[PDB]
UniProtKB/Swiss-Prot annotation:
GO terms for cellular component: cytosol. Belongs to the gamma-glutamylcyclotransferase family. This is Gamma-glutamylcyclotransferase family protein YtfP. It comes from Escherichia coli O157:H7. The gene is ytfP. Disulfide bonds: none annotated.
Length: 113
């Protein structure tokens, strides 16, 4: 399925799938969203910022692989966003952001200005 990459443009190959069937649709930064950094992985939600992310088309079963690995048990919610390159799954923070770091900029890097 199509999913939004908010984990650097460098993304991650994961195990194999994420560099094999991963079709680069193109870059797509979304405004009115902000990025959290909760220690390991990041989180993204509607707010005030431009998330300089990238949109990919990966295999549908590969999607179930990511979902089953990420939110097995109930970690995040699936926010389906309709992009010009196709509707992509956005994972929104579903557990308290109390004491997290906020990138109101929307980009992972930013500080190269």
């Amino acid at each position: 399925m199509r999913i939004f990459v908010y984990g650097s443009l460098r993304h991650k190959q994961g195990n194999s799938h994420w560099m094999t069937n991963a079709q680069l649709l193109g870059d797509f930064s979304i405004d009115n969203y902000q990025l959290y950094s909760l220690g390991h992985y990041p989180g993204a939600v509607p707010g005030n910022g431009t998330v300089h992310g990238e949109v990919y088309r990966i295999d549908n079963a590969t999607l179930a692989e990511l979902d089953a690995l990420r939110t097995r048990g109930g970690e995040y919610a699936r926010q389906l966003i309709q992009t010009p390159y196709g509707s992509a799954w956005m994972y929104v923070y579903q557990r308290p952001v109390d004491g997290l770091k906020l990138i109101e900029s929307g980009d992972w890097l930013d500080r190269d200005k």
